[PDB]
Specification:
The structure is a homodimer. With 347 residues, chain A is an alpha/beta fold. The first copy, chain A, contains 12 helices and 12 strands. In chain A, helix 1 (14-26) crosses helix 7, helix 2 (65-72) packs parallel to helix 4 and helix 6 (200-209) packs across helix 10 (310-323). The complex binds nicotinamide-adenine-dinucleotide (NAD) (2 copies) and 2'deoxy-thymidine-5'-diphospho-alpha-D-glucose (2 copies). Chain B: Catalyzes the dehydration of dTDP-D-glucose to form dTDP-6-deoxy-D-xylo-4-hexulose via a three-step process involving oxidation, dehydration and reduction. Chain B: The active site is at 124 (proton donor), 125 (proton acceptor), 159 (proton acceptor).
Chain lengths: 347, 346
C-alpha cells in the first residue's frame, strides 16, 4: 500500500468496520486510525478483535475541527464512512444528518486540503433518486439510463440521501477549486455481518430470532441492488489506491431483488411460514428501485465482486446473527419501540 | 395570492430589487426582509421604501428562533439570502457552508412547521459549465449545449456547490415532507445596486474611480446576462403560478464573453479599448454558462423585457455614475481585498 497511516471515519459502524478488518487482514503495512463518534450505530465490539498497535480507535466527531486537525496531521489518507445513514431516522429528525453528513464532510475536506492528503468519500447510490421497476422500462433494466452510472443526474429523495448528495457535491467542488486529491464511490445496498438491526435484512433476521414478526413496508415491491460488504471493501480499496483523482466510481454486484422476495427467502431459510410477517406503514417518499451499472469500476480498475450468490451470502448472514445474538439482543426492544412510533400493521 | 411574505437577503442586490418590484407593483403585499447585513447587505438599498409595505429585520436565516418568530406571521418565504461570490468562496468557504446550506435548511424547517410557500432562489452555476460555442457541433444551439431543467448538477466551487446542495435539500423536503417549494436557477444578473466586487459594477466603478478595469486571464469565459428586473418578474411568476416541486431556469438569452463586455463598457465610458489590466485567473474558473428558459416561458408566460444588453448596460453605467456615494466608501476596501489574491499579468 502507498498509504501507511490512514484515518477511517465511521470505522466503528457496519461498512466501515468491515473495511478496517479488510485492511487489517490484507494490508499489514497499513496503520489505521478510526475516528468514530459511537452514536447509536457505532459499536466498539465491531473493532475489538483488531484494536491494538495496528488499529487505534479515537472517539470523536468528524465535525470537531481541532480533533480532525490533530489526526489529519499524522495521516496520509482519509477514507470517509462516517455518517447518519438511516432514511427512516432522517425523516424523523434531519438534524444529525445535516451536521454529520454535510458539516462533517466539509470539516474533513478542509483538513485534507490543509495537509494535502488523499481523500476517498464513501457515498450511496441513493443520491441518484430512484428508478422505475424493470417491467415498466422499455429496456427491461438493460437500456441506457435504466441503471445508475457515473453520469446519472443527482436527484435525492430524503434528508438522508440529500445530505449525502450534498456532501458528494462539495467533495467534487473541492477537487476542482482546490485540487484536493479525492475520489468518490456510490454503492448499492450492503448486507452482511455487523449491520445494525435497524436496517432491512438484519431487522427481519433478528426479529425472527427474537420471536417478533418481520416488517415489510407496503407491498414490498421496492427493489434494491444487494452487495456483500466484503465486495464493497475491495471496491473502495481499488478506488483508493488506483482511482483517478476527481472521479466517481459506482460499486454494485448486479443483485437486484424486491424486498418481498428477500423477506420470503429469509423466512424460508429460517424455517418460517411464507406469510409469517406484517405489512406496515410504507416510508414517506420511499424510493422505488435502485440498480447499479459498475462497468467503470470493473473495466478501469479491474475490480470484480466475489459474493455474487445472494442466497449463499444471506445464508451466512443469517448464521452470523444467529451465532452472535449477544451482539444485538440488548438493542432489539429500543429499535422496535422506536419504529412503533411511526409504523403500524396495515392490512 | 400572498399578503405577508418574508424576503431573505432583501438588503442585497437581487433581493432588494425584488423588494422594490413588490413595493411598486403589489402594494397590497406586506414584505418582511430578513437580512444579516454582511459586507453585501445594504440598508441604502431599502431605506427609501421602508414603511407599511416593507420592514427590515436584521438577523441570520440560521437563527432558528428568529426565523420561527417571523415564519409564524408569514404566508410565504422568497429566499435570496446567501454568500454569493465565487472569489470569496475560494478565499474562505466557511460562511458559504453556514449561510447557503445551514441557512436554507433552517428556513425549510420553518416552512415545514407552518406549512407555507417557499421559493428557493438559486443559480445556473449548480450545473457546472459548458464548452464555448465555437467548440460545439450545434454552435450552442444543439441539445445539451445549454442548461435545461434536466441538466445534471456539477458545481465547480464552494459557492456553487453550497448553492447546489441547498437546491437538493429543498427538493428532498418536497418529496419527503410535502413542503410547498419551487426553485429557480438564474443566469448572471446585472443592474442597479449590485455590489462592486462583481464583474460589471467593478469595471464601471473602477473607471469612475480612475482605476484600471480588471479582466481574468484573456476574458474567454462566457456569461448569460439578464437584467435583475427580468429576474424579479420571473420569481414573482414562479411564486404565484408555479407548480410545487418544480425547478425553473431563468435566462434572457444574452451570452457574452467577459472581454467583449469589458470592451463595451470601455467604449461606452469613453475609454481606450486597451485601458485595462489582465489579472490572475480564477481557480477552477467556469468556462461558459447558458440558460434555456423555454420551460418558464412556455408554462408561465414569462417574457424578459430587457433583452437589449447594450441599452441595459448603458443605463447601468449611468446609475453607478449618478450614485457614486452609494459605492465610493467601498472601492478602496474591495480593491485592497482583491490585491491579496490577484495581480496584473505581465
Ligand atoms: N448501509 C449501506 O448499505 C450503505 C450502502 C452505500 C453507501 N453507504 C454509506 O457508507 C457509509 C457507512 O454506512 P453504514 O451502513 O456502515 O452506517 P452505520 O450506521 O452502520 O455507521 C455510521 C458510523 O458513523 C459514526 N458516526 C455518525 N456520526 C458521526 C460523526 N459526526 N463523527 C464520527 N462518526 C460518526 C457512527 O457512530 C457509526 O459507527 C456512510 O457514509 C453511508 O452513507 C451505506
Ligand atoms: N448575482 C447574481 O447574478 C445571481 C444570479 C442567480 C442566482 N443568484 C442568487 O440570488 C441570491 C441573491 O444574490 P445576490 O447577488 O443579490 O447576493 P448579494 O451578495 O448581493 O446579497 C446577499 C444578501 O444576503 C444577505 N446574507 C448573507 N448571509 C446571510 C445570512 N446568514 N442571513 C441573512 N442574510 C444573509 C447579505 O447581507 C446580502 O444582503 C443568492 O441566493 C444567489 O445565489 C445570484
Ligand atoms: C428497516 C426496514 C426496511 N424495509 C424496506 C425499505 C427499503 O426499500 C428496503 C431497505 O431499507 P433500508 O435497510 O432502510 O435501506 P435503504 O433505505 O434502501 O438504504 C440503505 O442503502 C443505501 C444505499 O443503497 C445507503 O445509502 C443507506 O445508508 C442504507 O441505509 O427495505 C422494510 O420493508 N422493512 C423494514 O423493517
Ligand atoms: C470580479 C471580476 C470577474 N471577472 C470575470 C469572472 C467571470 O467569468 C465573470 C463574472 O464574474 P462574477 O461577477 O464574479 O460572477 P460569476 O462568477 O459569473 O457569478 C455570478 O453569477 C452567478 C449566476 O450565473 C451567481 O450565482 C453568482 O452569485 C454571481 O456572483 O467575470 C473578471 O474578468 N474581472 C473581475 O474583476
Amino acid at each position: 500500500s502507498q498509504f501507511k497511516n490512514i484515518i477511517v471515519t465511521g470505522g466503528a459502524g457496519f461498512i466501515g468496520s468491515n473495511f478496517v478488518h479488510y485492511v487489517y487482514n490484507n494490508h499489514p503495512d497499513v496503520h489505521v486510525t478510526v475516528l468514530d463518534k459511537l452514536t447509536y450505530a457505532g459499536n466498539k465490539a465491531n473493532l475489538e478483535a483488531i484494536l491494538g498497535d495496528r488499529v487505534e480507535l479515537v472517539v470523536g466527531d468528524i465535525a470537531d475541527a481541532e480533533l480532525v486537525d490533530k489526526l489529519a496531521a499524522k495521516a496520509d489518507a482519509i477514507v470517509h464512512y462516517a455518517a447518519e445513514s438511516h432514511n427512516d431516522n432522517s425523516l424523523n429528525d434531519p438534524s444529525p444528518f445535516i451536521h454529520t453528513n454535510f458539516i462533517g464532510t466539509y470539516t474533513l475536506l478542509e483538513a485534507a486540503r490543509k495537509y494535502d492528503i488523499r481523500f476517498h468519500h464513501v457515498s450511496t447510490d441513493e443520491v441518484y433518486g430512484d428508478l422505475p421497476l424493470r417491467e415498466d422500462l422499455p429496456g427491461h433494466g438493460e437500456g441506457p439510463g435504466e441503471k445508475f452510472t457515473a453520469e446519472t443526474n443527482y436527484n435525492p429523495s430524503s434528508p438522508y440521501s440529500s445530505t449525502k448528495a450534498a456532501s458528494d457535491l462539495i467533495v467534487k467542488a473541492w477537487v476542482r477549486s482546490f485540487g484536493v486529491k479525492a475520489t468518490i464511490s456510490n454503492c448499492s445496498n450492503n448486507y452482511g455481518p455487523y449491520q445494525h438491526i435497524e436496517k432491512f435484512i438484519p431487522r427481519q433476521i433478528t426479529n425472527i430470532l427474537a420471536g417478533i414478526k418481520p416488517k415489510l413496508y407496503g407491498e414490498g415491491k421496492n427493489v434494491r441492488d444487494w452487495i456483500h460488504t466484503n465486495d464493497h471493501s475491495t471496491g473502495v480499496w481499488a478506488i483508493l489506491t488506483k482511482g483517478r483523482m476527481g472521479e466517481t466510481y459506482l460499486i454494485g454486484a448486479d443483485g437486484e431483488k424486491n424486498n418481498k422476495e428477500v423477506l420470503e427467502l429469509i423466512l424460508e431459510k429460517m424455517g418460517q411460514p411464507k406469510d409469517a410477517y406484517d405489512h406496515v406503514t410504507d416510508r414517506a417518499g420511499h424510493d422505488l428501485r435502485y440498480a447499479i451499472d459498475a462497468s467503470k469500476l470493473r473495466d478501469e480498475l479491474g475490480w470484480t465482486p466475489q459474493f455474487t450468490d445472494f442466497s449463499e451470502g444471506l445464508e451466512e448472514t443469517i448464521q452470523w446473527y444467529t451465532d452472535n445474538q449477544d451482539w444485538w439482543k440488548a438493542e432489539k426492544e429500543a429499535v422496535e419501540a422506536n419504529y412503533a412510533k411511526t409504523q403500524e400493521v396495515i392490512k
